[PDB]
């Protein structure tokens, strides 16, 4: 089909934004060890919201890209509106760039004033630092986008793949409405904040990623739609059975009742299972592959995604999910380590996977790229992926020493925050080095196009 | 074992647990007045929360262990800088003197806060430290 073309600007923008994201990562990583670097021009927190908002926005773009590509091909018709996909692309790209420029060009409190945050205060919450107008604007794009892609499912074939995608997509936008909800009570504010963050990334986003994985497996493997769609349902069943009460592993120390200690620890113990199943999924359906596929990279992206998401979300998640352990590690470099690997392995990787599949045939080049371009992709994959295991190993070592020095001993014996950080310096240099190997991988991946 | 079987497991499991979760939510919600001492949650502390947000403290600090890992935990800073009695006075000095300009040290910004604002901040932080947090953090260092 031809309206599948509108997915191209989405994937290309996502990759540009991904570059931006890494650059601001590298700025913060230097700030860790040369504390006054770029100060007072770009204080750490400004660099941070740029890094974290570019991460969320680029992945969102990748998701819309992924939908715009596979939804026509599942629905067995043209996308409801190629021209809507294009207005929406430009609106979303303008709002992203505008709010990012806001961050860098006006001190945060000033940006707050300037956007009339006093009337509807939603600003200055982690991952939610965008002005209420930006948030409001993001909802409108979501509505447009949902109408566009969801009309296409309505007037066409319904497959489980597209159904599950739509459910994830709808749930993502719905839960985003909680960002408009900013309670005056601190623990209430934190309680509802996780309905965005956790119910996305360990719930509704897992539906999106499963769907994209399943579609790609269908197209690369020639194994029967029926079995693939069955496992999809198993995987997402396990995601929401573990993950919904699972939200409780964020409810240990925010000020909610101690029953969450049990509920959070026990349901979370099971949250690795869907990622384990995605590894059995991709590995099995790829080795029971009824055919060969001219693009060997997609197959690698798909297996890699599942192994990394399982390491990052599953193993690292579990490693700190039990309350008696989380008590010591909560809000520590361990958190940053888990967070980097989980976000990269599950979500950055599944976006690059669908791009691997969809790019050559969006650029009317065919199923696969020439065999020189295919080895670059593979190099940028090993470079990005290995670099990230190193990033997470160094931050893991950092968090272990941080917990040992600062969290374990009693008052008097425990080291102070700033003193502990100086002791961690070497781990932060290494992470920065790894962050350099990663950019090199991203450039290598980019130069494969 | 069929697709159909798998889809109904998905359906039932998710509705059941969606409902379990809301019931727990409702309950939790009713306990919050006591756990968080909402009696003390004055106009001053609610304005402090606004200052906290308006300046993105959380982009550098953790509060109750959530936020950024660049700078110290502020949930229990009260106890490490002169307690109930003198914390407001400390904070007033603390916000004025920034940045400290020690070469190579992690820097905090000058926020040009008025003293009303800094006082509201202090009340907010003081109140935060008194939330029943199931005894988190482990010690006075946060």
């Amino acid at each position, epitope marked *: 089909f031809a309206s599948q073309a509108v997915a191209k600007p989405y994937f290309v923008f996502a990759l540009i934004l991904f570059v931006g994201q890494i650059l601001f990562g590298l700025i913060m990583g230097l700030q860790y060890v040369v504390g006054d670097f770029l100060f007072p021009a770009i204080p750490f927190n400004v660099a941070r919201m740029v890094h974290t908002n570019l991460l969320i926005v680029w992945l969102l773009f990748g998701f819309m890209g992924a939908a715009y590509y596979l939804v026509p091909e599942e629905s067995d018709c043209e996308l409801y509106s190629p021209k809507l996909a294009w207005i929406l692309f430009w609106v979303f790209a303008a709002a992203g760039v505008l709010t990012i420029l806001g961050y860098l060009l006006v001190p945060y409190a000033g940006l707050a004033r300037l956007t009339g945050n006093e009337l509807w205060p939603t600003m200055g919450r982690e991952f939610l630092e965008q002005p209420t107008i930006s948030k409001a604007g993001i909802v409108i794009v979501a509505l447009g986008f949902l109408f566009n892609v969801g009309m296409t499912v309505l007037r066409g074939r319904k497959t489980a793949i597209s159904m599950v995608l739509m459910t994830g997509l709808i749930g993502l936008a719905l839960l985003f409405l909680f960002s408009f909800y900013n309670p005056e009570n601190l623990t209430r504010d934190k309680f509802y904040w996780w309905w965005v963050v956790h119910l996305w990334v360990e719930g509704v986003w897992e539906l999106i990623m499963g769907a994209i994985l399943a579609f790609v497996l269908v197209k690369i493997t020639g194994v029967d739609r029926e079995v693939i769609e069955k496992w999809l349902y198993v995987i997402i069943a396990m995601a929401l059975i573990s993950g919904i009460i699972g939200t409780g592993h964020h409810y240990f120390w925010i000020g909610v009742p101690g029953y969450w200690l049990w509920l959070g620890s026990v349901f979370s113990a099971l949250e690795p299972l869907p990622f384990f199943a995605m590894v059995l999924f991709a590995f099995n359906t790829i080795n029971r592959r009824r055919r060969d596929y001219p693009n060997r990279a997609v197959a690698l992206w798909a297996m890699g995604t599942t192994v990394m998401a399982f390491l990052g979300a599953g193993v690292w998640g579990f490693m700190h999910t039990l309350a008696p352990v989380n008590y010591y590690t909560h809000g520590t470099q361990l958190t940053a380590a888990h967070g980097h690997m989980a976000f990269y392995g599950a979500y950055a990787m599944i976006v690059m996977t669908i791009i691997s599949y969809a790019m050559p045939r969006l650029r009317g080049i065919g199923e696969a790229m020439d065999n020189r371009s295919q080895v670059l992709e593979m190099w940028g994959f090993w470079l990005m992926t290995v670099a990230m295991v190193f990033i997470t190993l160094f931050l893991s070592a950092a968090g272990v020493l941080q917990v040992w020095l600062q969290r374990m001993p009693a008052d*008097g014996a425990a080291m102070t925050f700033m*003193a502990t950080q100086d002791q961690l310096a070497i781990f932060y240099w290494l992470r920065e080095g790894a962050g350099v190997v990663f950019l090199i991988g991203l450039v290598a991946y980019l130069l494969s196009f | 074992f069929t697709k159909g079987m798998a889809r109904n497991i998905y359906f039932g499991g998710s509705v059941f647990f969606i409902l379990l979760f809301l019931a727990l939510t409702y309950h939790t919600e009713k306990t919050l007045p006591e756990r968080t001492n909402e009696a003390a949650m004055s106009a001053a502390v609610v304005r402090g929360k606004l200052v906290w947000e308006q300046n993105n403290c959380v982009g550098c600090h953790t509060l109750l262990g959530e936020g950024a890992y660049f700078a110290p935990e502020l949930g229990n800073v009260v106890g490490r800088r002169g307690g109930e009695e003198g914390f407001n006075t400390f904070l007033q000095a603390w916000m004025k003197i920034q940045p*400290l300009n020690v070469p190579g040290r992690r820097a905090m910004p000058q926020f040009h806060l008025s003293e009303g604002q800094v006082d509201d901040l202090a009340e907010f932080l003081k109140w935060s430290s008194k939330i029943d947090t199931n005894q988190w953090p482990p010690n006075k260092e946060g």
Partner: antibody, heavy 124, light 108 residues
Framework: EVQLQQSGTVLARPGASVKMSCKAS????????MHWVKQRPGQGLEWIGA????????SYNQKFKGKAKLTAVTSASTAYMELSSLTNEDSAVYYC?????????????????WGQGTTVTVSS | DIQMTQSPPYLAASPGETITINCRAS??????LAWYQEKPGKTNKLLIY???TLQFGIPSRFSGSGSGTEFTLTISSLEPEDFAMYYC?????????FGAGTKLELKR
């Protein structure tokens, strides 16, 4: 309340050695440089050196490299200074003091708490 | 080593008056100069650091300024407890060094 409690007056013969202590309370002993400072009467303060109990590293004024040895015992929050091969010129008050800022890389800063001083009288 | 000259060495003044005392450094110490107050039977008390930053708890009648090479300390309206010995210390470079002091005396 941050306090530094120094040991009492010591008398020694020329060429001998002397060891004094500084007992720290009310803070994270391992998170701050301990400084030592010499004052002979009508003579202006002189910085001898410092020890970082968090890793045992030390730093000495070139003028005191031979003279002074600094150590710390972390379980007791006590810092120590040993002065060797004494001379009339080592008769003085000796202060310990805590860096006002925590961490290893603030070695050259100012001090916010001082002990009351240990007198060393070198005489025959 | 950077050497430090305080002047004057003695200054007589009265309660309610304003004085200002000087500190000079033999080379640039950027802005990094602290002041201590010394009194008999009390431990030395940090007053100002980084040239003009008041230390927590110190009354606002004390202030200081300077950079590079020349620094001053002012007390705005002398109080009885301010008659004391004052030392400056550079905190820009190894090895730390101190001025020899200005003694502020009660005029009668």
């Amino acid at each position: 309340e941050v306090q530094l409690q120094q040991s009492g007056t010591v008398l020694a013969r020329p060429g001998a050695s002397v060891k004094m202590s500084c007992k720290a309370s009310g803070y994270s002993f391992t998170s701050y440089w301990m400084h030592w400072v010499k004052q002979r009467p009508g003579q202006g303060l002189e910085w001898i050196g410092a020890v970082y109990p968090g890793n045992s590293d030390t730093s000495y004024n070139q003028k005191f490299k031979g003279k002074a040895k600094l150590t710390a015992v972390t379980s007791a929050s006590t810092a120590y200074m040993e002065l060797s091969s004494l001379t009339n010129e080592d008769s003085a008050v000796y202060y310990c003091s805590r860096s006002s800022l925590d961490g290893y890389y603030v070695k050259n800063w100012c001090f916010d708490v001082w002990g009351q001083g240990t007198t060393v009288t070198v005489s025959s | 080593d950077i050497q430090m000259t305080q002047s004057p060495p003695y200054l007589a003044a009265s309660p309610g008056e304003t004085i200002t005392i000087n500190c000079r450094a033999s080379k640039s110490i950027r802005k990094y100069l602290a002041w201590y107050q010394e009194k008999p039977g009390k431990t030395n008390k940090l007053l100002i650091y980084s040239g003009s930053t008041l230390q927590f708890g110190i009354p606002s009648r004390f202030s200081g300024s300077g950079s590079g090479t020349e620094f001053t300390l002012t007390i705005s309206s002398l109080e009885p407890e301010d008659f004391a010995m004052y030392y400056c210390q550079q905190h820009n470079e190894y090895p730390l060094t101190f001025g020899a002091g200005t003694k502020l005396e009660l005029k009668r």
